[PDB]
Amino acid sequence: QVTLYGTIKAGVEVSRVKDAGTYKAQGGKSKTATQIADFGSKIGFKGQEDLGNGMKAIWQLEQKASIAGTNSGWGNRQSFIGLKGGFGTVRAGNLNTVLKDSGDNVNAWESGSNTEDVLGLGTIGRVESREISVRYDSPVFAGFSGSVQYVPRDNANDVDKYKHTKSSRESYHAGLKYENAGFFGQYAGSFAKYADLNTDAERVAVNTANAHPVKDYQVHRVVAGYDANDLYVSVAGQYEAAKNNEVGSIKGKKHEQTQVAATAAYRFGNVTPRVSYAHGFKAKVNGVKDANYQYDQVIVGADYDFSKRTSALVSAGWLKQGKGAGKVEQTASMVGLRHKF
Amino acid sequence: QVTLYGTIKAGVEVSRVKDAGTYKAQGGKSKTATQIADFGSKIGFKGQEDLGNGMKAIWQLEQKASIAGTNSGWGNRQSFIGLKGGFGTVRAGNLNTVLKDSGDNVNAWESGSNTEDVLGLGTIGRVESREISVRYDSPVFAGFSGSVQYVPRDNANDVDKYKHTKSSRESYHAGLKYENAGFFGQYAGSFAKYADLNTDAERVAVNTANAHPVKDYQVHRVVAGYDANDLYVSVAGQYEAAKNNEVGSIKGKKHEQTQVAATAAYRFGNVTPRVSYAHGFKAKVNGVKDANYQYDQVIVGADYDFSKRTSALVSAGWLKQGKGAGKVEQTASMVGLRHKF
Amino acid sequence: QVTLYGTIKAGVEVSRVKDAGTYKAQGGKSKTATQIADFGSKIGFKGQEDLGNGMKAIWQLEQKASIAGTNSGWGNRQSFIGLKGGFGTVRAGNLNTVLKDSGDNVNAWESGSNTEDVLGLGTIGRVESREISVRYDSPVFAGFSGSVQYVPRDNANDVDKYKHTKSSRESYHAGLKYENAGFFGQYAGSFAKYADLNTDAERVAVNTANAHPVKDYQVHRVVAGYDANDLYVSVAGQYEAAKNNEVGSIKGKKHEQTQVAATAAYRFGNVTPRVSYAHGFKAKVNGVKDANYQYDQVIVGADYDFSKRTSALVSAGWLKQGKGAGKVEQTASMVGLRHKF
Ligand SMILES: [Cs+]
Ligand SMILES: [Cs+]
Ligand SMILES: [Cs+]
Ligand SMILES: [Cs+]
Ligand SMILES: [Cs+]
Ligand SMILES: [Cs+]
Ligand SMILES: [Cs+]
Ligand SMILES: [Cs+]
Ligand SMILES: [Cs+]
| Cα dist from B10 to A117, A159, B36, B68, whole Å | 46, 41, 8, 9
Which residue, C171, C90, C177, is CA-closest to C134? Answer: C90
> Measured between alpha carbons, how far is C59 from C51 in angstroms, rounded to an integer?
14
A100 membership: H or E segment, kind and range: helix A98-102
Instruction: Say whether residue B164 is in contact with chain A using an 8 A CB cutoff.
Output: yes
B47–A306: do the CB atoms touch at under 8 Å? no
Q: How far apart are the first and last CA of chain B?
A: 17
Task: Compute the nearest-CA separation of C51 from chain A (Å).
Answer: 29
PDB experimental method: X-ray
Asked if C123 and C278 count as a contact pair (C-beta separation under 8 A), the reply is yes
Where are the strands (E) in A182-211, listed by range?
A: 183-197
> Measured between alpha carbons, how far is B178 from B186 in angstroms, rounded to an integer?
6
Q: Which residues face C313 on adjacent strands?
A: C303, C336
Instruction: Say whether residue B42 is in contact with chain A using an 8 A CB cutoff.
Output: no
Three-state SS for C99? helix
Three-state SS for B292? helix
C42 membership: H or E segment, kind and range: strand C42-50
- Judging contacts by C-beta atoms under 8 Å, the chain A residues touching residue B74 are 43, 63-66, 69, 71-72
Shortest-distance ligand to the CA of residue B203: 6
Angle at the Cα of C150 (from C149 to C155), degrees rounded to 5? 140
SS3 labels along B219-277: EEEEEEEEEECCEEEEEEEEEEEEEECCCCCCCCCEEEEEEEEEEEEECECCEEEEEEE
Backbone angles phi, psi at A59, to 5 degrees: -155, 160
> Measured between alpha carbons, how far is A75 from A63 in angstroms, rounded to an integer?
5
Q: Which residues face A170 on adjacent strands?
A: none
C92 membership: H or E segment, kind and range: strand C88-96
A277 membership: H or E segment, kind and range: strand A271-280
What contacts A67, CB < 8 A, 6 or more positions away? A8, A10, A38, A41, B59, B61, B75, B79, B80, B81, B93, B94
Three-state SS for C18? strand
> Measured between alpha carbons, how far is B321 from B337 in angstroms, rounded to an integer?
29
- Judging contacts by C-beta atoms under 8 Å, the chain C residues touching residue B310 are 49, 51, 57
Task: Compute the nearest-CA separation of A111 from chain B (Å).
Answer: 15
Backbone angles phi, psi at B39, to 5 degrees: -95, 15
* Alpha-helical regions (H) of chain C: 98-102, 153-156
C10–A132: do the CB atoms touch at under 8 Å? no
Architecture, CATH, for domain A1-341: Beta Barrel (2.40)
Nearest to A75 among C4, C9, C69 (CB): C69
Torsion angle of the four alpha carbons B234, B80, C76, C78, in this order, in degrees rounded to the nearest 10: -70
A101 membership: H or E segment, kind and range: helix A98-102
Asked if C291 and C323 count as a contact pair (C-beta separation under 8 A), the reply is yes
**Inter-residue long-range contacts of B239-246, CB under 8 Å, 24+ positions, other chains counted:** B240/B127, B240/B201, B241/B216, B241/B217, B242/B195, B242/B197, B242/B214, B242/B215, B242/B216, B242/B217, B242/B218, B243/B214, B243/B215, B243/B216, B244/B212, B244/B214, B244/B215, B244/B286, B245/B194, B245/B213, B245/B214, B245/B215, B246/B212, B246/B213
Number of H helices and E strands in chain A, helices first, is 2, 19
The burial class, CB within 10 Å (0-12 / 13-18 / 19+), for C340 is: middle
Instruction: Say whether residue C207 is in contact with chain A using an 8 A CB cutoff.
Output: no
B293 membership: H or E segment, kind and range: none
> Measured between alpha carbons, how far is B203 from B214 in angstroms, rounded to an integer?
10
Which residue, A197, A280, A206, is CA-closest to A239? Answer: A280
Tell me B156's DSSP state.
Answer: H
Asked if A306 and B51 count as a contact pair (C-beta separation under 8 A), the reply is yes
Angle at the Cα of A256 (from A252 to A260), degrees rounded to 5? 170
> Measured between alpha carbons, how far is A53 from A37 in angstroms, rounded to an integer?
47
Asked if B337 and B313 count as a contact pair (C-beta separation under 8 A), the reply is yes
Instruction: Say whether residue B149 is in contact with chain A using an 8 A CB cutoff.
Output: no
Shortest-distance ligand to the CA of residue B38: 4
Which residue, A86, A98, A90, is CA-closest to A58? Answer: A90
A274 membership: H or E segment, kind and range: strand A271-280
Three-state SS for A153? helix
Instruction: Say whether residue A109 is in contact with chain C using an 8 A CB cutoff.
Output: no
> Measured between alpha carbons, how far is B280 from B240 in angstroms, rounded to an integer?
11
Which residue, B179, B250, B251, is CA-closest to B215? Answer: B251
Among A4, A8, A19, pick the best mutation site for testing chain B contact (most B Cβ within 10 A).
A8
Amino acid occupying residue A20 = A
Where are the strands (E) in B86-211, listed by range?
A: 88-96, 130-137, 144-151, 171-180, 183-197
Q: Which residues of A30-59 are buried (b: 16+ CB within 10 A; e: fewer)?
A: bbebbbbbbbbbbbbbbbbbebeeeebbbb
Among B8, B29, B35, B110, pick the best mutation site for testing chain C contact (most C Cβ within 10 A).
B8
| Cα dist from C333 to A28, A161, C336, whole Å | 61, 15, 10
Where are the strands (E) in A198-270, listed by range?
A: 212-228, 231-244, 254-266
Nearest to A69 among B81, B94, B152 (CB): B94
Which residue, B57, B42, B56, is CA-closest to B9? Answer: B42
> Measured between alpha carbons, how far is C79 from B176 in angstroms, rounded to an integer?
40
C30 membership: H or E segment, kind and range: none
What contacts B93, CB < 8 A, 6 or more positions away? A10, A36, A38, A67, A68, B75, B78, B79, B80, B81, B82, B132, B133
Q: What's CA C45's distance to the chain center, in Å? A: 22
What contacts C269, CB < 8 A, 6 or more positions away? none
Backbone angles phi, psi at B154, to 5 degrees: -80, 0
* Alpha-helical regions (H) of chain B: 98-102, 153-156
Q: Which residues of C208-246 are buried (b: 16+ CB within 10 A; e: fewer)?
A: eeebbbbbebbbbbbbbbeeeeeebebbbebbbbbbbbb
Shortest-distance ligand to the CA of residue B76: 6
| Cα dist from B20 to B16, B24, B55, B116, B293, whole Å | 13, 7, 60, 21, 17
A294 membership: H or E segment, kind and range: none
Which residue, B58, B50, B87, B60, is CA-closest to B6? Answer: B60
Q: Which residues face A219 on adjacent strands?
A: A190, A240
Task: Compute the nearest-CA separation of A47 from chain C (Å).
Answer: 8
Q: Which residues of B217-255 are buried (b: 16+ CB within 10 A; e: fewer)?
A: bbbbbbbbbeeeeeebebbbebbbbbbbbbeeeeeebeb
Residue C200 CA neighbour count, 13 Å, CB half:
11
| Cα dist from B197 to B94, B122, B246, B310, whole Å | 20, 16, 11, 38
Three-state SS for B30? coil
Instruction: Say whether residue B205 is in contact with chain A using an 8 A CB cutoff.
Output: no
Output the CA torsion sign for B336, B338, C1, C6. Answer: positive
- Judging contacts by C-beta atoms under 8 Å, the chain C residues touching residue B309 are 49, 57
> Measured between alpha carbons, how far is A323 from A318 in angstroms, rounded to an integer?
15
| Cα dist from A39 to A35, A67, A111, A114, whole Å | 12, 9, 5, 10
CA A299 to ligand 1 centroid distance, Å: 14
What contacts C125, CB < 8 A, 6 or more positions away? C103, C106, C107, C116
Among C3, C4, C8, pick the best mutation site for testing chain A contact (most A Cβ within 10 A).
C8
Three-state SS for A124? helix
> Measured between alpha carbons, how far is C14 from C336 in angstroms, rounded to an integer?
12
Which residue, A119, A115, A110, A117, is CA-closest to A10? Answer: A110
| Cα dist from C63 to A27, A52, B107, C59, C87, whole Å | 53, 31, 31, 14, 29
CB count in 10 Å sphere of residue C176 = 17
The burial class, CB within 10 Å (0-12 / 13-18 / 19+), for C284 is: middle
Asked if C195 and C216 count as a contact pair (C-beta separation under 8 A), the reply is no
> Measured between alpha carbons, how far is B211 from B246 in angstroms, rounded to an integer?
10
> Measured between alpha carbons, how far is A172 from A134 in angstroms, rounded to an integer?
10
Instruction: Say whether residue B83 is in contact with chain A using an 8 A CB cutoff.
Output: yes
CA A318 to ligand 2 centroid distance, Å: 20
Strands C254-266 and B283-285, how do they pair? unpaired
